[PDB]
Design a protein around this ligand. Structure first.
Ligand SMILES: CC1=C(O)C(=O)CO1
Ligand SMILES: CC1=C(O)C(=O)CO1
Lengths: 230, 240
């Protein structure tokens, strides 16, 4: 029960850093693209830039939404009618942050599936020219986090407000903690916690993900206490 | 009996080590992958426009200057542009440097082993890629990484106070290590008696009067290099 919380804590520690450093590369690419677009944002620059393989092979899609609503994405995608990037959560989030941010998951305007977007504003001479965004798949992140097994439980992502952001259990996504654990609702603080999910007793531990811009997200470990102690 | 007990502890410990090495190995892979993709975007951008304005403005962009000590373009005709700015040594030719030759020998993005900086005479690692426009190679982009930086990434976690991590080539050249004296020495020079072998996975060896357990994990997705993550565990403390 002690040597346990010595390894639990240390999993979350490097696991959190793994997801931290996976993300960090993608954020740099989004920021570098925006900084380029600040100096040159002509249409052929924009398309050339977003066609570049470093982008395409890193996010589902990479795009520029401009302050006049003009939209350019890569790769090509059939587009829904009445689309306006300025209305979208990556756009609003980025303008609010005045810099790099990560959306909580929202319903993609094209696929109607959930995604997360890393975005930032394109800004030149105290003018917002638009926002750059890069789309990342939830399942692609469930994998990065649930990369390890010892076989007792799984990992997932939660906000400092209890909103479940990523998960191996597809139903859990975007539900609060109080709606998965209504009795003995686990505090998202330091330490460990006990709760019953589906009828089994499970330990729950939280680790801060360092270095995520403009958000406060936690790695969550969920163990079966029975299997763990045995 | 002592044989079956000590085999259960060794096997338990080896399991823990193998999964510490897997995730630490992923962490440095991702960290390195991120710097290699930033050098590739910088080169693909330059391929489309390499005028002196554009080059200067691009290399000054904060995403580059806060990730690398220096970012630079060396061109086939030997012209060199670096930001941040630096006093430069006489005779400098970018095309003679390890980063420039490696990249062109690689055909794409690669990583150098530690080499001596032409400017600071100190050991650095460089992420680099050729600038390719219409089949041609206009030059090479390089991004500089400090060794203390990589030592920190791979030593994030303490392995229960059991030991530490370093990086080593497939040929046994210690590339990055918490003890400066070890950098660029060989496993043969540091463990002259029972030199750990990289293919074996778990080796037992002796350093500074204590028995260490050495474990090696491939790092995936580093173009043109074969580096391993190495853990060194104090055997006695680990077993205890
Ligand atoms: C189509 C794509 C989605 O991620 C949005 O809703 C904005 O860019
Ligand atoms: C400035 C730059 C360094 O990384 C070298 O030592 C060669 O080019």
């Amino acid at each position: 029960r002690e040597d346990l919380e010595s390894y639990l804590r240390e999993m979350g520690d490097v696991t959190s850093s793994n997801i931290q450093n996976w993300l960090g590369g993608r954020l740099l690419l989004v920021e570098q693209t925006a900084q380029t677009l600040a100096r040159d944002h002509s249409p052929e620059t924009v398309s050339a830039l977003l066609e570049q393989p470093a982008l395409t092979s890193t996010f589902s899609f990479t795009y520029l939404g401009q302050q006049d609503g003009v939209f350019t994405m890569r790769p090509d995608s059939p587009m829904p009618a009445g689309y306006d990037p300025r209305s979208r959560p990556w756009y609003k989030d980025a303008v609010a942050a005045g810099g790099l941010t990560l959306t909580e998951p929202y319903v993609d305007a094209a696929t109607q599936e959930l995604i997360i977007t890393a975005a930032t504003p394109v800004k030149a001479a105290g003018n917002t020219l638009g926002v750059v965004g890069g789309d990342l798949s939830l399942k692609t992140l469930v994998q990065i986090i649930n990369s390890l097994d010892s076989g007792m439980g799984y990992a997932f992502l939660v906000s400092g407000d209890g909103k479940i952001l990523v998960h191996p259990d597809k139903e859990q996504v975007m539900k609060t903690l109080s709606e998965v654990y209504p009795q003995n609702t686990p505090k998202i603080a330091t330490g460990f916690s006990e709760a019953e999910l589906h009828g089994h007793t499970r330990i729950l531990a939280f680790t801060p993900i360092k270095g995520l811009p403009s958000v406060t997200w936690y790695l969550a470990l969920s163990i079966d206490k029975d299997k763990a102690y045995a």
